[PDB]
Each structure stands twice: as structure tokens, then as C-alpha cells.
């Protein structure tokens, strides 16, 4: 309104951060970074809220400035850094590595991974082009730009990136039978396989996913991420595996988990 805004009033935050109303008047507004605004998670909503390591939003800064937390191998200090889908948050002390994946309610899970898995991440290509001096590049979903890819890589192929070197290691095409994790819209977090794909020259090509209990559903392609072949996935899925239970079965599960 003459320039970019800078505050974000809580109640206009993303609904999936689970920020309680009546605790203050504003919400952490993510800086500009790799991931978009509505579909990121700042590090202060992750360190403070989720893991309960901090109590304030000041002790978060005194964690980040001791050079402790690193997103994707590189050590980050901007306390509202937009962490996002498929990142690898390493905390050196506590010996922990997390990856940010969804879960079938739409949130962002606290999903610890092992060490040797914490050294790659997946990136869905978003464009391929000839760069400059005739050098091809790919542009993945987290803003990366990788020169010299394998010429069989086209738009919507999922690439597997080695965090240290930064180079592409591996890739996965986009075809039926591929395992798909859905990051966007109403089915946010469900895992199925592809069954079909509709053409629509002109806009918004749809995709018929089917999960592992035979419940098909349709999403736009924009919201589809490919994470491996049938059976075998490449990342490690969170618990519950993307099934989308239904609430009567959810309560039968909870109640039958009556252990004390």
C-alpha cells in the first residue's frame, strides 16, 4: 500500500501453523526465501511451538545466533527463515535431523530422520531452459538452479539432490504407477499412486491418484509431487503413511488404543 507489507496479523497466518489466538496480536511473517509465504514454516514456529525447545521468541534468537540450527546443510540465523517442504533441519547438539513433510491433516510433522538420509532432498523441477552461453538449467521447487542436468529430465520430474555437493544425483520421471505425495489443496498430505492424467490444453491438467486402500481422488497437477516407484519411496514417509482415515475409524482407533 505504497510498498511491501511487513507485519502479519495473527488470524491472517497460515492455518497450519496452529498459532493460538489471544496470545498476541501479530504472527511471525516469513522473510523472502526459497518457499512461498503461505506454504512455509518459519524457524520460530518450528523451534518454539513444535519442539518446545524455546519458551520465548527471544530464546529462539539466542539459539539461532549460536550457529546451531542449519537448514539444508547451511547455517541460518534469520529467525523467520521460510523453511519448507522437503528441507532437512539439522540440529548438531541433540544429534537430530528433521525433515519437513506433511501429515494427512495438513500440518507439518515433526519427523526425525536418520543421518544418511539427511544428506539428500527431493526437488520437483519447475522449469528447464537454456541458460546463458548455451548452458541448460533446471529450476526446482525450492528456488534452486542447477546447471547441466541429464537431458531426459523434463518438467514435473522429481530430482534427488545431494545437499553437500549440491549436484543432482538421481531423478524420477512422471508416469502412471509412480508414487505421489500431494502437497496442496484439499487433499494435502495424501499418498497414492498415479492412475491417469488428463490433458486440457489451456489450463490445469488434472491427475487421478489412488491411495493404498483404493480411494481415488483428483487433484490439479500443480499440487502433485512424485516420490518414488510403486512400493518403494525415496524419502521416509511419516507415521500413518498418508492414509486419510475417516472420523469414525479414527475414534475407534483412539479408543481401542486405551493403553495405560
Amino acid at each position: 500500500a505504497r510498498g511491501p507489507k511487513k507485519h502479519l496479523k495473527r488470524l491472517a497466518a497460515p492455518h497450519h501453523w496452529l498459532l493460538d489466538k489471544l496470545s498476541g496480536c501479530y504472527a511471525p511473517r516469513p522473510s523472502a526465501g526459497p518457499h512461498k509465504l503461505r506454504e512455509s514454516l518459519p524457524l520460530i514456529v518450528f523451534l518454539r511451538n513444535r519442539l518446545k525447545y524455546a519458551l520465548n521468541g527471544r530464546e529462539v534468537k539466542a539459539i539461532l545466533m549460536q550457529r546451531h540450527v542449519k537448514v539444508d546443510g547451511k547455517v541460518r540465523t534469520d529467525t523467520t527463515y521460510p523453511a519448507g517442504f522437503m528441507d532437512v533441519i539439522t540440529l548438531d547438539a541433540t544429534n537430530e535431523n528433521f525433515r519437513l513433510v506433511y501429515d494427512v491433516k495438513g500440518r507439518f510433522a515433526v519427523h526425525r530422520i536418520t543421518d544418511e538420509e539427511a544428506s539428500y532432498k527431493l526437488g520437483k523441477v519447475k522449469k528447464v531452459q537454456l541458460g546463458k552461453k548455451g548452458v541448460p538449467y533446471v529450476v526446482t521447487h525450492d528456488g534452486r538452479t542447477i546447471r547441466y542436468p541429464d537431458p531426459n529430465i523434463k518438467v514435473n520430474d522429481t530430482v534427488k539432490i545431494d545437499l553437500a555437493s549440491g549436484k543432482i544425483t538421481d531423478f524420477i520421471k512422471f508416469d502412471a504407477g509412480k508414487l505421489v505425495y500431494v502437497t496442496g489443496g484439499r487433499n494435502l498430505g495424501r499418498i497414492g499412486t498415479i492412475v491417469h492424467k488428463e490433458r486440457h490444453d489451456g489450463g490445469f491438467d488434472l491427475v487421478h491418484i489412488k491411495d493404498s486402500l483404493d480411494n481415488t481422488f483428483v487433484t490439479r497437477l500443480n499440487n502433485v509431487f512424485v516420490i518414488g516407484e510403486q512400493g518403494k519411496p525415496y524419502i521416509s514417509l511419516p507415521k500413518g503413511k498418508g492414509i486419510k482415515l475417516s472420523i469414525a475409524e479414527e475414534r475407534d482407533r483412539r479408543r481401542a488404543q486405551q493403553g495405560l
Binding site: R10, L11, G24, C25, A248
Partner: protein, 185 residues
């Protein structure tokens, strides 16, 4: 700028102030359970109106509708837990019974009197609101505390009352020191 802390009123005025059956009914209720004004009765009739209408609006479903099965089991489970409904009468139909005296019998005041530690209804309200009974080991001093089905075994005299065996309280110590000071020291 903050988010609004919502609220809403728990009672509502009925149709008409006078309708002499209504005045006679409210007198029977507010004299039998030892109540204070008409707002207590109207609050309970507002609760029971909400319960009975949402249960009615379920009955205009069909069996094996997921919405009816889910929220019917929810409502029945809650009304069983409060004690209002029975244990055997657990169909959705039976909550279109449930007159107001069923709620006003689970009230903590009457539940003290029924347990026979209170000698009247009004004496029970006064023991409640003077910090004397303790439902869990939590001293409750609200008289409208809607006792649950399995709190009911744990109502007893509060461990820091003078009846729950602590210390003679205020006037008993004053008289004790007065007697044993006028006689001796």
C-alpha cells in the same frame, strides 16, 4: 486488534412471564431443589432445549447415515456420563424424554443432600458455598457443579474444613480460649 474471545449467554427468557402453570411449576422446582432465582431454571431449560432439538434433528436422518451415527453416539455418551440418562436406555430415542428434574438432580447441591451429609437442601448449599466439600480432593464451592457419574463416590468433607478433621475454625477457637482464659489462663 487481537482476536475476539467469544462468549454467549447461557439462559433465555421463555415465551410469557405469567402462565399460571408455569409459575406453579417454577415454584415447585425452585422450592424442591433449593434454587435462587428464575435464571437457574431458565438456564437448565435452555440446556435441555438445545439437547433435545439437536437430537430431534438427528432423528430426521436415516439410520446408517454417518453424521447421525457419529453425533448420536457422541450425544448419548455425554448424557450417559453426566448421569442424566440411564445405562440401559441408550438409544437416541430416549433423549426426547428427559425432563428438567433429571438435570437438577445431578446438581452438586442436591447430590450432597442425597448423600445424607447435609440435613436439608439449603444447608447443603451453604456447606457448598462455604468451602466445605471436596469432590475429587478439589474443594468445590460452586452449587451448580453438574456431578458426573463417577465423581459421585468421591464426594466427602474437605480435608481442610473443620468437619473434614482439620481445626476447629473461627468461633470454636474463640470460645475455647474465652472459656479456658476466664477459668484459668
Amino acid at each position: 486488534p487481537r482476536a475476539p474471545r467469544t462468549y454467549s449467554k447461557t439462559y433465555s427468557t421463555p415465551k410469557r412471564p405469567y402462565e399460571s402453570s408455569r409459575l406453579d411449576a417454577e415454584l415447585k422446582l425452585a422450592g424442591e431443589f433449593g434454587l435462587k432465582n428464575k435464571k437457574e431454571i431458565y438456564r437448565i431449560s435452555f440446556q435441555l432445549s438445545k439437547i433435545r432439538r439437536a437430537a430431534r434433528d438427528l432423528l430426521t436422518r436415516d439410520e446408517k447415515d454417518p453424521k447421525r451415527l457419529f453425533e448420536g453416539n457422541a450425544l448419548i455418551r455425554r448424557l450417559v456420563r453426566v448421569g442424566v440418562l440411564s445405562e440401559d436406555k441408550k438409544k437416541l430415542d430416549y433423549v426426547l424424554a428427559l425432563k428438567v428434574e433429571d438435570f437438577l438432580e445431578r446438581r452438586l447441591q442436591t447430590q450432597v443432600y442425597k448423600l445424607g451429609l447435609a440435613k436439608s437442601v439449603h444447608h447443603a448449599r451453604v456447606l457448598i458455598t462455604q468451602r466445605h466439600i471436596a469432590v475429587g480432593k478439589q474443594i468445590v464451592n460452586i452449587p451448580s457443579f453438574m456431578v458426573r457419574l463417577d465423581s459421585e463416590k468421591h464426594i466427602d468433607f474437605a480435608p481442610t474444613s473443620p468437619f473434614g478433621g482439620a481445626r476447629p475454625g473461627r468461633v470454636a477457637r474463640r470460645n475455647a480460649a474465652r472459656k479456658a482464659e476466664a477459668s484459668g489462663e
